[model samples]
Each structure stands twice: as structure tokens, then as C-alpha cells.
Target chain A: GTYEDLVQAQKEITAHNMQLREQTKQLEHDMAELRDQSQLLLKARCEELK
Target chain B: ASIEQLLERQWSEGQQFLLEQGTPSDILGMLKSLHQLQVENRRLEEQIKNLTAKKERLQLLNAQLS
Candidate 1:
């Protein structure tokens, strides 16, 4: 591929990477919340089991 | 654009709209969907990693070839 063509492909990938970066951050925050809730459920279940 | 046609054209926007509007403060529901969030996170992370590697490799390859 030509230098110009390869650079353009790189630029496109960078564009996609930026979008995914934002999405991953959003999911990370959500995951933290989900994990906290799951842990809470586990704690409550253990309390009941004993 | 007709509402029906516009919905088809607004794929990304429509999805974003739904996601932004997605509000269900139900712990059970969120727990049920926890697996999906992890899977989606991993999938997107993998995609970002590979895409970044492609860009970096392409840049170096271009340097060597040209």
C-alpha cells in the first residue's frame, strides 16, 4: 500500500480507538457499581447462611 | 425524512439515545446483566488493543516500505 493509504488507515484506526476508549471508561464505571452490588449480595447471603 | 426511514438512518444515534435513556434501578436486573457488561468491556478493550497495534504496525511498516 502507498504511504498515503497506510497513513489514512492508521488515522481511521485512531479514530475508532478514541471512541472505544470513551466507551471502555464508561463501562468501567458501570462495572465497578455492578461489582459492588454483587459483593453486597454475597455478604448478605453469607450472613443468612450462618 | 419519514419517522420510519429516519429510525433506520439513525442507527448510532438511536442506540446512544436508548443507552442514555436506559434507567432501571433494579439490582436484580443489573446483576443479571453484569456478565454482559464484563463481556462487552473485554470485547471493546480487545478491539481497541488490536486496532492500536494495527495503527502502530502500519505506521512502522509504511516507514520501512517507503
Candidate 2:
């Protein structure tokens, strides 16, 4: 019974780690896209100033 | 403590750790912010497009007058 419980806890931890990894990847991609768009806007504004 | 009680406690701690690190509400908050930023980004892009078009029209009119 104790061994089963330990296995269950281990499974939960593995699942949680997988979720965290995917979410981190998603956020990193989102931030990069946002940064790129912001830079594009900045450049456009500079051109308008000229 | 009994083995059963210990297992229960360990399970509870595991749940708490999951809540702290992998909760849906936290992810929802992140998604909400990203959505808002995306909306704002689109709006800015449209604004810039319109402004550039207007500038070009004005420049063309000025050149015609000159």
C-alpha cells in the first residue's frame, strides 16, 4: 500500500513537471512574438517622424 | 502516524505543490495578459497603417501644389 502511494505521488510530480515545461515554452514564444511586434511598431514610428 | 495517514499527508502536499506551480487560474491570468497585449498590438498596427496612408496622401497633395 505504501509503495502504491509512493508511485502515485511520483506520477503526479511527473505530470506536473510536464505541464510546467509546456507552459514555459508557450510563454517564451508569446513573449518573443510580442517583442518582435513592439520593435516593428517602434521602427514605423521613427519612420513617421522623418 | 499510520502508513495510511502518512500517505494522505504526502498526497496533500503534492496537491499543494501542483496548485502553487501548475494551477489553471495562474495560467488563465497569463493568457489574459497575452490576449490584451495582442489586441493592443493589432490596434497599434492598424493605427500606423492609417497614419502612413494619410501622410502619403498629404505628401502627394503638397507636391501637386508645388
Candidate 3:
């Protein structure tokens, strides 16, 4: 029971963590896109004012 | 036998109680990885949350742009 129990728990934890890593990657990518858009908008607004 | 032994016992019991209930001493190495994985999971979750918040803030700014 000891061996299997730790092994099973480890499996679940490792798998769940794999998904979390993927989500972290996507969220980071999304943040980069959003920042780019914000920069472009501000730049355009400044040019229009000038 | 000494102070270090007591500290070692503490680390073992702490690790075992939460996750070593069924495992043997030989499994300690694997247990370490499991603990590390959990630690990494929390860090990733927190990072994702922070990124999401920043994305929303940028989204709002992007929308407000004229």
C-alpha cells in the first residue's frame, strides 16, 4: 500500500502540474499580445494628438 | 543520537505524515520529487493568475484607446 499510494499520488500531482504549466504558458502568451495592443493604441493616440 | 538526528527525524516525519504514510524509507527520493512538483504547481498557478490580471488591465487600456 505504501509504495502504490505514493506512486499514485505522485502520478496525479505530476499530471495536474503538467496542465498548470501549459496554462501558465498560454496566459503568458496572452499577456504579451495584450501589451502589444496597448502599446499600439497609445502610440496611435499620441500621433493623432500631434 | 544528536541535534542533527532530531532535525532529520523532523524532516522525515513531516514529509512522511503528509505523504509518506504508506511509503518506505527508500521512497524518500521519489517523495522529494512529489513535494517539488506540488511546489511548482503553486508557483505556476500564481504566475497564471498574475498574467491573467495583467492581460485584463491591458485589454481595458486597449479598449479605451481612441
TM-score of chain A, every prediction, order shown: 0.61, 0.63, 0.63
After superposition, which runs of candidate 1 have C-alpha atoms over 4 Å from their true positions?
Answer: A1-4, B1-66
Clashing pairs in 1: none
Q: Judging by DockQ, tell me the better candidate of 1 and 3.
A: 3
Maximum-DockQ candidate = 3
Q: Which tens-of-lDDT digit does each residue in A1-50 have in candidate 3?
A: 87889899999988988888788888878888887888888899999998
Best by lDDT: 3
Model 3: how far residue B33 lies from native, Å:
3.4
Model 1: per-residue Cα lDDT over A4-50, one tens digit each:
55455545555655688796666556556555655666677778789
Alpha-carbon lDDT of model 2: 0.55
* Tens digit of per-residue lDDT, candidate 3, span B1-66: 975467557767888685647646668777787767766777777787888888888888888994
Question: By descending DockQ, how would the candidates be arranged?
Answer: 3, 1, 2
Give each model's clash number. 0, 0, 1
Q: Candidate 3 chain B: minimum summed lDDT over ten consecutive residues — where?
A: B16-25
lDDT of 2 by residue, B1-66 (tens): 975467557656855775787766644444444444444444544555565565556555444433
Once model 3 is optimally superposed onto the true structure by TM-score, how far is the C-alpha of residue A38 displaced, in angstroms? 0.9
Cα RMSD (angstroms) for every candidate in the order listed: 22.6, 18.3, 6.7
Grade the docking of candidate 3.
medium
Report the number of the highest-TM-score candidate.
Answer: 3
